[PDB]
């Protein structure tokens, strides 16, 4: 019998799913959520053995331990131990598509454990084993006898072991198969791994036991009265003395309580459920649950004899909140949500897909620190602890089934096939049966990227029938099918329609108002944070806030899916698809995160925070208007900090308490400002500071900021007339200008400033030449590979037009000596196949004050793909420690991703100006700069720049960040103009038109000097 | 592995479900629906042995035939060969309620066959085996080798035999388990059998094959234009040269054709279905399919090469029809339906649940002959030919899933369990896949009597999503759940509410207008025809006709589920529950038909035929208005015959052809009425006749009738004064009267007429005593038996009051002499435990003409249960040939079942006056009778009566008709008054208040005379 190749069989002898149990026998331990002695952990050291296929496991293995076995940590993924390779493939199945068959060579992993069982446990009561997560299907033996079988990689599989165990020493044997008919529904865009990867545990229940419980909370019209409604189910022999008591606690007060015998209401012509009882507790003025204020009451479900003997107590955290869609909005406790969400995969760089508390918490605090309030379980039910943290710390969660059939042609081929409705139902019902009493789950999802098939309709309805407290969403089949209560497209652009056939991604603003449309829209995936990305983020939030029915989205995604490899020396590095002998593979597409796998944040993460702010600001003369975007909480942990500066020079600053009601407003008057006497632009900068620490933030946390321009007085006063006049010395090869101990050289055969000297030390390593290219970002590149070109990729259009192999061509090199300055005039052309791509017309002016004034006017051929940048580079000899600039910072910014950056005087170490994306590209730019200092040099103007030890050439050549070597000197790029980075998605051009460089003609001017 | 005890395993290696195939290789054979070489029936003499449990089956049966095995016929139920008992159980399971387990004693049938196969089937192609129905689960071997496993007893199981087939002799081996986890979904109110009870066959397909095809027909606003859409699916190797052609035939005329290459439209992001194609044929002015006119087109689906070579062809019948529910109405072709329907179980008194063409055709004719237009497949999908017969003769069909969990407590224990959804979904989905192309199927049913659970919700939505062309219904959980498009209760009375908790059965009229309700109502069952029943039928049809949203129902039900047993003298007799040693059993409850098992009608059938007429009549003076109720046809096969008669004596008649349009009115004026000479009542009669034979009826079929009272001439002339005087001769013991050769003897102690005389021939045996009781009908008894008494039952009310044993207690017996006559005056009182139940006061009068005028006046204690009858009985000495009566008939009628009867002179043999219900009771009543001749006797007046060789004693004491024996002479009951027979259901009192005898005081006079 080949059960792993049969969608008719997804389990054998597996127990019914249910909410989390611990089988407490002291009601007080249950109340306080302390450990229970009836819930043992079996996590630790086990005996592992790898085999190429199930047919190749020795028959002795069932009875005796294998000599060639190893001792390994369970839970784990055997790939993370090196037994075989993890595979990164997005869409295409890692297997031959031949349902329901799998490869014959089926990497098989043979886990065993020798553990001890106390005698008491076996004398009375049921003993079961719980496999929280096994990938992707496994058989189970206990002491040589066969126990059962199970599929689904992401929901617990439970097995009654009462009849199999003995006193003291016992032995498990778990035959985990990598490939199974399960895998056809587990085709998510993520590393393919396997094994026993979540907790293993033993559960001792009484024979007469609580077998299930459902908590429901409904309200009156203003949430001042609530009825908690708990349905309890039991197994065992029914007796009149039996009772369930349900008691609700807020901290340590008991606020409500209900006691009844078993025997539910009459349901039909045969009567009612003898083995169920429903308790109804009235609760005046309940404290409501939200992400803002995550209030939690505690429910204790006691099964006991009426005369007062506790049989067992089970329990859960309860949060009084109401989720519904009325008149086209998604309401929570009456109010319209704004979903500042992120998609988060369960991933660790060392541990693979094995989740731990420390990392989950690290993830949550950062999420909440950067202004998120929601997270999608993409694309499976998470480790059970995760919901508990979301319950407690406060987050809106979308719980999503382990169903993805992305590799199918068409994508619905399995989801429309009735013979797959059994395996799909199991993946939806068992999630619901497991998670339905977690407050943090507000939305149920039917899975991911699996077309639209009658099965989606069937299961959608099943949920709706079983659980009306949570709306049901599903993106498949074009995001607005009959299987979704919410339009939830992935990567639908704000303004631009992408009218694909059958499944068009309409513009979000447009989608809402389609004939007969009324539903709310919350993107399930948007802003594809792969590499240098999130260009266009502000465009969504402006929209989100303007349109009531646009209620947010979920970014793709949270954490880069990189893995650690070690080199010859034992030094660690970050690996992506293909780096494991895995073939085929989608290379670096596993890394679409806001943070690196170690949780160091991409610069993209700051923009998200600033846009996801909970306070909005307007300025009107000398009045700041603060508006709250909170639905429930006041601003009881907020002070407003303001600062006025003349070009980075602090002039004044104050502090005013924020006392803003939810959705309310505060008007703040600033003192009459001192009106400055010297030239420059003023900048007002408000910051919202949280003076007090919280569960999720430190004292002083900045949760919001904003800048404005105030008065500007333009410099009209002249520079002092310097008496000295620079000497031009014309040679055969060079126009050499001199001033004091300062020296310029202009190679006349190339037409560039080829050297400088301060005193007598050389200042340059490469000549100062124009640049109209960049080391391509992931969004420039997209799906394009050497063997499958996408000629519509920005990079591939740039290559074809000859941008990267465009040779300069000298047209003019002239010197003029003036009254008090020497003037150099150059003109250039870049050509590819008899085609002038660009033309650059320059003037250099060196005066008696030793300040070189460069003027650059560039022509761009109207029919060459709009250029990546319009600027200059050189390779200075200088390597300094500090970069000081007056401009946008402190972090990396680009034209279409620069809202979170502030205009000010910044100062940082040189390595902070390099941004270490695993896949190396252009990086570290800061726009809107008026002054740049780097050692002896100063640049003034109005430009964008980056500075590092990495040439654009080395960047575009190198495949991995760790393979980069610090080049000699410092490479500087000073752009007058720079193309946006885009990132609406990352496999089609996504840089919005107003961010592409199409003006045709460009002009920028730089004063270059030494101080 | 015990698969018969696992609802996670419903099949192994079973090929997919599909419409009926034939793999024709000649398009003309396809078009004409002739046999195909490629489909062999394996029905015939198989080998069979029976086993007590699957564990007792020897391993030598897989390779060789067991010598002890008998050669038996297949298809069959092994019960009908008498290998074990058939079990009749209504609600309670035939096994212990222990999901998923069945008993370890599980009757097991070992079928097998040695067969030979064509060389070309061994050479190429797919050869599958198709068991149309195996009850209940089975394993399959071919040539010693294991093939697969199957469940669900009422849909076909198909497996591929290609890899198993050998040269020469092959051997099948089918192990049939009577009980399985499948038994828990098959709990219908019927006989419990098993075996291979439907067709077994071999189908030989090309490798590149048609694997599915869908035929849809949509319409415009007037059905003057129609599109036929045909979705075609294939398996095997696609090649650029393959084509599909869908042609549509009407008689010998192609009407339209569609040819195209495989390649469907873009479905989702990943493309379309390359292995499918959808053909669209435009058809102008189509002939629509209705039960009124079964207009059929023929559809041929050719898989062929573009160069013109045919690979194979499949085909079906097409009826252009649209079924929608709009503004609260079930419309067919845009017209509101009136469902004149019945539930029909697959039953035969010799063969069990095996079906044949001769039986079906018999059933279909009879139903259509008796004014039925719809039928419910109660409660499973039927043998496949049934739908074809329905398509062709024209009946509306409810196709019902094979899911019934009547025995669960509560009824939804399984249907609300997500562990049972897979097993359930197979049973629903696979019916559609099979049956979706039959025009006759207008409604999908989700099963029967299984409560309401989320599984029902899930599958409803699946059907809506998969087949939008058909409304889905289901009675479970209240008859108006979220799971039905039609309010489809069972046994919801017309005017009376029955406010049951959770599942109330409202009065149908009230149900419609329940607040917020809009859906239409059609009873999925009504009018329990159990024994002497169908009383109160006319009340349904009056309401059906008045309320537009009441759109009919299906009677429970067609045929009696009696099974033939033979006696000691080898003589057949009809047997019910417990007659096979089966226990527990629900006795005569398997028998609720309008026809007997042999398809002889019960007398309730003629009532139904009358009430379900298609022409309505009114009389206004001399003007008959004839109204057609037909939705589509004109009366192209009807002529009205009219007839006037003065007390049975023809006065005039005539014919006028009906030329009535559908839903129109014809006014037929009767000629100047011939005014009669004598004294009596004129009665108008009208019979509608079909002169031409049809496919469903002989030439001369009477389809409708109606009577009316016209002018009455009250008799006034005085008796012609005779010159004879009756002489009173009073003795001590008996008041005795003479008159010529006539002699009357009234007893003084009893107080009744004890003996009459004609010469020396005594006329009586049992004296003319009163009667206030009847041998109880099935409706009178209900659910009550000796061990559990139902105190509510009509019978148990009469038993417990004394009605059945109370004795006459004479209060007076006098004899005054009149001038021209003699006058006897009696009084009686009936008592029990000191209570006076009935006082009876009579006055016999004998004049010189021989006429004896009996005048009766009865008192009834207001607080005794209302009695079954008020009248007289005597056992007459003579045994006769004929009965002759002026009054309603000719067939048996009761107060609430006499609309179908007609007033006239009827002459039948004595045995037609006895109705041989398998459970004997009160029978052969004829109401509204004015004259009654039998032998020389004659009873005049206004009364009802029955006349048989069986006493009310023998009938109430015998439980089976076959065990009755004619008694000496003839029992006559003459009733002044009879209570209704009832039957809105058969488990609670259902006799309507207006047919209960409740007045307290009752009068009626008789005249007895020798003619
Ligand atoms: Mg995907
Ligand atoms: Mg089974
Ligand atoms: Mg039933
Ligand atoms: Na909004
Ligand atoms: Na990805
Ligand atoms: Na690179
Ligand atoms: Na009607
Ligand atoms: Na029955």
Short mmCIF file of N, CA and C in Angstrom, two decimals, chain A residues 1 3 6 8-9 12 14-16 91 266-273 275 406-413 418-419 421-422 425 429 433 454-455 457-458 461-462 465-466 501-503 505, chain B residues 1 3 6 8-9 11-12 14-16 91 266-273 275 406-413 416 418-419 421-422 425 433 454 457-458 461-462 465-466 501-503 505:
data_model
loop_
_atom_site.label_atom_id
_atom_site.label_comp_id
_atom_site.label_asym_id
_atom_site.label_seq_id
_atom_site.Cartn_x
_atom_site.Cartn_y
_atom_site.Cartn_z
N UNK A 1 0.85 -1.23 0.00
CA UNK A 1 0.00 0.00 0.00
C UNK A 1 0.87 1.25 0.00
N UNK A 3 0.66 4.89 0.51
CA UNK A 3 -0.24 5.92 1.02
C UNK A 3 0.21 7.32 0.69
N UNK A 6 -1.26 8.62 -2.63
CA UNK A 6 -2.71 8.44 -2.67
C UNK A 6 -3.45 9.56 -1.92
N UNK A 8 -6.54 9.85 -1.67
CA UNK A 8 -7.67 9.27 -0.96
C UNK A 8 -7.33 9.06 0.50
N UNK A 9 -6.06 8.80 0.77
CA UNK A 9 -5.57 8.56 2.12
C UNK A 9 -4.62 9.68 2.54
N UNK A 12 -4.19 7.82 8.71
CA UNK A 12 -4.67 6.53 9.19
C UNK A 12 -4.60 6.47 10.72
N UNK A 14 -5.59 8.51 12.92
CA UNK A 14 -5.29 9.83 13.48
C UNK A 14 -6.49 10.37 14.25
N UNK A 15 -6.25 10.98 15.42
CA UNK A 15 -7.35 11.54 16.22
C UNK A 15 -7.86 12.88 15.69
N UNK A 16 -9.08 13.22 16.09
CA UNK A 16 -9.71 14.46 15.65
C UNK A 16 -8.93 15.67 16.17
N UNK A 91 7.67 28.52 -8.50
CA UNK A 91 6.45 28.06 -9.14
C UNK A 91 6.54 26.59 -9.52
N UNK A 266 -32.40 20.63 21.88
CA UNK A 266 -32.94 19.81 20.79
C UNK A 266 -32.57 20.42 19.43
N UNK A 267 -32.00 19.58 18.57
CA UNK A 267 -31.43 20.02 17.29
C UNK A 267 -32.26 19.53 16.11
N UNK A 268 -32.77 18.30 16.21
CA UNK A 268 -33.64 17.73 15.17
C UNK A 268 -34.59 16.65 15.70
N UNK A 269 -35.23 15.93 14.79
CA UNK A 269 -36.22 14.87 15.11
C UNK A 269 -35.71 13.72 16.00
N UNK A 270 -34.39 13.53 16.08
CA UNK A 270 -33.79 12.53 16.98
C UNK A 270 -33.39 13.15 18.32
N UNK A 271 -33.52 14.47 18.43
CA UNK A 271 -33.17 15.17 19.67
C UNK A 271 -31.91 16.00 19.57
N UNK A 272 -31.09 15.92 20.62
CA UNK A 272 -29.92 16.79 20.75
C UNK A 272 -28.62 16.05 21.03
N UNK A 273 -27.55 16.82 21.24
CA UNK A 273 -26.25 16.25 21.60
C UNK A 273 -26.17 15.96 23.10
N UNK A 275 -23.83 14.53 24.56
CA UNK A 275 -22.44 14.74 24.95
C UNK A 275 -21.92 16.17 24.72
N UNK A 406 0.49 25.99 -7.15
CA UNK A 406 0.96 27.00 -8.08
C UNK A 406 1.52 26.44 -9.40
N UNK A 407 2.05 25.22 -9.34
CA UNK A 407 2.73 24.62 -10.50
C UNK A 407 1.81 23.96 -11.51
N UNK A 408 0.53 23.84 -11.16
CA UNK A 408 -0.45 23.21 -12.04
C UNK A 408 -0.77 24.02 -13.30
N UNK A 409 -1.12 23.32 -14.37
CA UNK A 409 -1.57 23.97 -15.59
C UNK A 409 -2.95 23.44 -16.00
N UNK A 410 -3.99 24.27 -15.86
CA UNK A 410 -3.96 25.59 -15.24
C UNK A 410 -3.90 25.47 -13.72
N UNK A 411 -3.72 26.60 -13.03
CA UNK A 411 -3.51 26.61 -11.59
C UNK A 411 -4.63 25.97 -10.76
N UNK A 412 -5.85 25.92 -11.32
CA UNK A 412 -6.98 25.24 -10.67
C UNK A 412 -7.17 23.73 -10.97
N UNK A 413 -6.23 23.11 -11.69
CA UNK A 413 -6.42 21.74 -12.17
C UNK A 413 -6.74 20.74 -11.06
N UNK A 418 -13.02 17.28 -8.18
CA UNK A 418 -13.73 16.76 -7.01
C UNK A 418 -12.98 15.68 -6.21
N UNK A 419 -12.16 14.87 -6.86
CA UNK A 419 -11.38 13.84 -6.16
C UNK A 419 -10.30 14.41 -5.23
N UNK A 421 -11.11 17.17 -3.29
CA UNK A 421 -11.87 17.82 -2.25
C UNK A 421 -11.68 17.17 -0.87
N UNK A 422 -11.41 15.85 -0.83
CA UNK A 422 -11.07 15.29 0.48
C UNK A 422 -9.75 15.79 1.08
N UNK A 425 -10.23 19.58 2.02
CA UNK A 425 -11.12 19.84 3.14
C UNK A 425 -10.35 19.63 4.42
N UNK A 429 -10.57 22.40 7.35
CA UNK A 429 -11.33 22.10 8.56
C UNK A 429 -10.41 22.01 9.76
N UNK A 433 -10.63 23.91 13.14
CA UNK A 433 -10.81 23.16 14.40
C UNK A 433 -9.69 23.40 15.41
N UNK A 454 -14.34 24.72 -7.83
CA UNK A 454 -15.53 24.49 -7.03
C UNK A 454 -15.21 24.09 -5.59
N UNK A 455 -14.03 23.50 -5.37
CA UNK A 455 -13.60 23.11 -4.04
C UNK A 455 -13.42 24.33 -3.13
N UNK A 457 -15.10 27.09 -3.38
CA UNK A 457 -16.48 27.45 -3.04
C UNK A 457 -17.02 26.56 -1.93
N UNK A 458 -16.74 25.26 -2.01
CA UNK A 458 -17.33 24.33 -1.06
C UNK A 458 -16.78 24.64 0.31
N UNK A 461 -17.78 27.99 1.97
CA UNK A 461 -19.11 27.85 2.58
C UNK A 461 -19.05 27.07 3.88
N UNK A 462 -18.20 26.05 3.91
CA UNK A 462 -18.05 25.25 5.11
C UNK A 462 -17.67 26.14 6.29
N UNK A 465 -20.49 28.55 7.27
CA UNK A 465 -21.43 27.78 8.07
C UNK A 465 -20.93 27.54 9.49
N UNK A 466 -19.72 26.98 9.62
CA UNK A 466 -19.15 26.62 10.93
C UNK A 466 -18.76 27.81 11.81
N UNK A 501 -5.63 38.52 -19.21
CA UNK A 501 -6.87 37.81 -19.56
C UNK A 501 -7.30 36.87 -18.45
N UNK A 502 -8.62 36.80 -18.22
CA UNK A 502 -9.26 35.98 -17.18
C UNK A 502 -9.07 36.50 -15.75
N UNK A 503 -7.88 37.01 -15.45
CA UNK A 503 -7.51 37.30 -14.08
C UNK A 503 -6.84 38.67 -13.94
N UNK A 505 -5.38 42.18 -12.97
CA UNK A 505 -5.12 42.95 -11.76
C UNK A 505 -5.46 44.40 -12.01
N UNK B 1 -5.40 -4.42 6.43
CA UNK B 1 -6.21 -3.16 6.45
C UNK B 1 -7.70 -3.49 6.38
N UNK B 3 -10.70 -1.87 5.36
CA UNK B 3 -11.22 -0.71 4.64
C UNK B 3 -12.73 -0.57 4.75
N UNK B 6 -13.46 1.94 7.59
CA UNK B 6 -12.71 3.20 7.55
C UNK B 6 -13.31 4.22 6.58
N UNK B 8 -12.22 7.02 5.88
CA UNK B 8 -11.13 7.73 5.20
C UNK B 8 -10.73 7.03 3.91
N UNK B 9 -11.31 5.85 3.69
CA UNK B 9 -11.07 5.05 2.50
C UNK B 9 -12.41 4.62 1.95
N UNK B 11 -12.61 4.13 -1.65
CA UNK B 11 -12.23 3.42 -2.87
C UNK B 11 -10.72 3.27 -2.94
N UNK B 12 -10.27 2.27 -3.69
CA UNK B 12 -8.87 2.21 -4.07
C UNK B 12 -8.74 1.92 -5.55
N UNK B 14 -10.01 3.28 -7.99
CA UNK B 14 -11.25 3.48 -8.75
C UNK B 14 -11.05 4.60 -9.75
N UNK B 15 -11.33 4.35 -11.03
CA UNK B 15 -11.25 5.42 -12.04
C UNK B 15 -12.33 6.48 -11.79
N UNK B 16 -12.15 7.65 -12.40
CA UNK B 16 -13.07 8.78 -12.21
C UNK B 16 -14.49 8.51 -12.72
N UNK B 91 -35.92 3.14 11.02
CA UNK B 91 -34.98 4.14 11.52
C UNK B 91 -33.75 3.47 12.09
N UNK B 266 -8.10 30.89 -21.72
CA UNK B 266 -7.25 31.17 -20.56
C UNK B 266 -8.10 31.20 -19.28
N UNK B 267 -7.76 30.35 -18.31
CA UNK B 267 -8.50 30.19 -17.05
C UNK B 267 -7.95 31.09 -15.93
N UNK B 268 -6.65 30.98 -15.70
CA UNK B 268 -5.98 31.69 -14.61
C UNK B 268 -4.58 31.99 -15.06
N UNK B 269 -3.77 32.56 -14.15
CA UNK B 269 -2.43 33.03 -14.48
C UNK B 269 -1.63 32.03 -15.30
N UNK B 270 -1.85 30.74 -15.07
CA UNK B 270 -1.04 29.68 -15.67
C UNK B 270 -1.50 29.18 -17.06
N UNK B 271 -2.62 29.69 -17.55
CA UNK B 271 -3.06 29.34 -18.88
C UNK B 271 -4.47 28.81 -18.89
N UNK B 272 -4.74 27.85 -19.78
CA UNK B 272 -6.05 27.19 -19.84
C UNK B 272 -5.94 25.68 -19.79
N UNK B 273 -7.05 25.00 -20.08
CA UNK B 273 -7.05 23.53 -20.20
C UNK B 273 -6.74 23.11 -21.63
N UNK B 275 -6.14 20.08 -22.56
CA UNK B 275 -6.83 18.80 -22.73
C UNK B 275 -8.36 18.91 -22.78
N UNK B 406 -30.64 8.52 9.11
CA UNK B 406 -31.84 8.61 9.96
C UNK B 406 -31.61 8.13 11.39
N UNK B 407 -30.72 7.15 11.56
CA UNK B 407 -30.53 6.46 12.84
C UNK B 407 -29.61 7.14 13.84
N UNK B 408 -28.89 8.17 13.40
CA UNK B 408 -27.96 8.88 14.28
C UNK B 408 -28.71 9.67 15.35
N UNK B 409 -28.07 9.82 16.50
CA UNK B 409 -28.61 10.67 17.55
C UNK B 409 -27.61 11.77 17.92
N UNK B 410 -27.92 13.04 17.58
CA UNK B 410 -29.02 13.52 16.80
C UNK B 410 -28.73 13.27 15.32
N UNK B 411 -29.72 13.50 14.46
CA UNK B 411 -29.67 13.03 13.08
C UNK B 411 -28.45 13.56 12.32
N UNK B 412 -27.82 14.59 12.86
CA UNK B 412 -26.72 15.24 12.19
C UNK B 412 -25.33 14.82 12.68
N UNK B 413 -25.26 13.80 13.52
CA UNK B 413 -23.99 13.49 14.20
C UNK B 413 -22.86 13.26 13.21
N UNK B 416 -22.40 16.66 10.39
CA UNK B 416 -21.79 17.86 10.95
C UNK B 416 -20.33 17.58 11.33
N UNK B 418 -16.59 16.82 10.17
CA UNK B 418 -15.77 17.05 8.99
C UNK B 418 -14.97 15.81 8.58
N UNK B 419 -14.92 14.82 9.46
CA UNK B 419 -14.25 13.55 9.16
C UNK B 419 -15.09 12.72 8.18
N UNK B 421 -17.10 14.29 5.74
CA UNK B 421 -17.31 15.08 4.52
C UNK B 421 -16.73 14.44 3.26
N UNK B 422 -15.53 13.83 3.34
CA UNK B 422 -15.05 13.15 2.14
C UNK B 422 -16.00 12.04 1.65
N UNK B 425 -19.02 13.68 0.30
CA UNK B 425 -18.83 14.43 -0.93
C UNK B 425 -18.77 13.50 -2.14
N UNK B 433 -21.57 14.07 -11.76
CA UNK B 433 -20.65 13.71 -12.82
C UNK B 433 -21.29 12.68 -13.75
N UNK B 454 -22.78 21.12 8.53
CA UNK B 454 -21.94 21.93 7.66
C UNK B 454 -21.56 21.21 6.36
N UNK B 457 -24.19 22.10 3.79
CA UNK B 457 -23.85 23.44 3.34
C UNK B 457 -22.71 23.41 2.32
N UNK B 458 -21.63 22.71 2.66
CA UNK B 458 -20.49 22.58 1.77
C UNK B 458 -20.82 21.99 0.40
N UNK B 461 -23.21 24.15 -1.98
CA UNK B 461 -22.44 25.19 -2.66
C UNK B 461 -21.59 24.61 -3.78
N UNK B 462 -21.07 23.41 -3.57
CA UNK B 462 -20.38 22.66 -4.62
C UNK B 462 -21.28 22.43 -5.82
N UNK B 465 -22.07 25.74 -7.61
CA UNK B 465 -20.89 26.19 -8.29
C UNK B 465 -20.62 25.32 -9.52
N UNK B 466 -20.83 24.01 -9.39
CA UNK B 466 -20.58 23.07 -10.50
C UNK B 466 -21.72 23.00 -11.52
N UNK B 501 -40.34 21.23 18.32
CA UNK B 501 -39.12 21.99 18.64
C UNK B 501 -38.00 21.76 17.62
N UNK B 502 -37.27 22.84 17.31
CA UNK B 502 -36.19 22.88 16.30
C UNK B 502 -36.64 22.63 14.85
N UNK B 503 -37.44 21.58 14.65
CA UNK B 503 -37.87 21.15 13.31
C UNK B 503 -39.39 21.21 13.05
N UNK B 505 -43.06 21.33 11.66
CA UNK B 505 -43.67 21.12 10.35
C UNK B 505 -44.86 22.04 10.30
#
